[PDB]
Amino acid sequence: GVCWIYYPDGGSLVGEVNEDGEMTGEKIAYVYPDERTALYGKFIDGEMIEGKLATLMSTEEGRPHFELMPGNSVYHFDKSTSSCISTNALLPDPYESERVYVAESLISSAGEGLFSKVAVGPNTVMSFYNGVRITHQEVDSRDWALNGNTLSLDEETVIDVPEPYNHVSKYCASLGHKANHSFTPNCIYDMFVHPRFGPIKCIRTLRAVEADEELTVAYGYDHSPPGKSGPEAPEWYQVELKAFQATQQK
Template identity: 50%
Template sequence: MYSVRVAYSEVDKGVEKAADRSSRTLPIAHTCDGPRVCACSTKTPGFCFYLTFSAALDHSETAIYSGSVDGSEKPHGRGTLTWKSGDRFEGRFKHGEKEGKGCFYFSDGSSLGGTFSADELFGKGIYVFDDGSWQEGQYVHGELNGLVKEFDNLGNLTFTGNYVENCRHGLCTFYDPYGGTLNGVVDEEGSLTGDSITYWYPGCELGIRGKFLEGILDRGFLVEMKDKQEEEEKKGDVFERDVSTKDCISANPLLPDPYETKMVYVKVSPIAGDGLFARRDLPEDRVVSFYNGIRLTHQEVDSRDWSQNDYTISLDSETVIDIPPSCSDVAAYCASLGHKANHSFEANCKYDLFDHPRFGLIKSIRTLKRIRRDEELTVEYGYDHHGLGKNNADAPHWYKSQLK
């Protein structure tokens, strides 16, 4: 076992980690032929390494090699290259070049592995991001070219599509964690911007097609899948981005959501008041209704009397969604219907998050089991989910009485 010093050139120490997966890029895994900024760095930020065994080395730019060498003391066989930054490559070498199985391990916790040939990554490669999500696809001369799939850290598919020279290209599909998909031809930046992008609701029976800007709906029309053929309803309603504020629940409060309309309806409930009912047989683990509302802070909600909180639901640590009294009746507001679901401690549904093309991030109602047509949907309101149980002072009296 020997150690030799190997010169390298760092083009970019950062791996771009955009929150929007549509703009994600990868390190370039190939060898350049000299101590210069490689032209490829203008395409994608990343690492660009070159190897040389000159006797005169700039030690500030050297990497340490540990492993087997050939008669010329070039890496040959299994070995490890370690850079000053903490990045390292582990794998097999052939007369100074990466050859065979190998993997880059970057100092930020990400990695890129696959099969190398003549110092370049060829064939299937897997890039694992520092958050545990990963990307797998075909590499040609160290760059992604061909079909690529991306997964979150739980193994859920988040993207399928083609790459050309490390960039997303052509028809691509993005999958959100709530069951929706976004499909269309990406622009030069690899994002879904254009006039013919389609958002598909869970189940891919209904969608909204039209103008999207970086994956965000601007204006679109209903699309319905019939007999495996897409049929665009151009003469129907127009759907636009309509995220609520503190003062406005919706710019079009009487425009129903087309997907929700096919899943549920409202009628008088034997439990209390109005209730939410299945319009069709519903599968298990499917979002079937949406809970939009004005957006308040927790402080605003906590400071007022409980009589004003009949329709409040926490969205996150900062925001509470609320249906104001003026919008509680479907005659005044029917853009979403989730607030009509009644409570049960033996609920057949639960609250969940949903990234809605029209309303943005809101709450939704997801089935816990199969539900038959005309069966009432119920959720557990969860006032006692903070460990206070029956003595929870923030629960209404009717709720506490049911806990007894």
């Protein structure tokens, strides 16, 4: 009865289905896109109730074989709320934990940045961009001082990492919001279906990246609103845009 469900991002859900073809049982797993790191345990209809850190070792005629890793950290479906970004804000993501770290940015005055822990190839998921879900209207109606971490998820939803959670001392369940901007980025924001965070975005490399290299992404603000007037972006970004284009000739 083993059924494998691969998401477009490369992650998967795997396990014996119920008499009704649902992903419900005590030996179900979510497997990250590395096809190695897994969250193994209790799921109900594809939803993670208690997944323990595991390693997918081999598969035999469709059936996977996991080794349960040491430690006692459990994970569960824990979608953010308006009163709660996460039930366990200081419980890091284990896949992300292996691939990235936060340190001072190499970009001048840019604050903290996100760095690779390891050498990876192109097309590699590195970090997750979880946050509270809000509307584009609320975001457009407020000061930029509040919109440093807003990321458009879909047409209807914006993911945000509001104060205090933009600090690792308060939130480290995901680290996507720590990656700084570049017009020549080594990463892109891409869709991701996460078993703990739900549908969010991730940071995926565009090219090979070495260990201790800073991860950057194109923030992609609108450079030419219908509006009459020029890019709707924070001032620091407008300055960098001017400087970058001076290396291009406009």
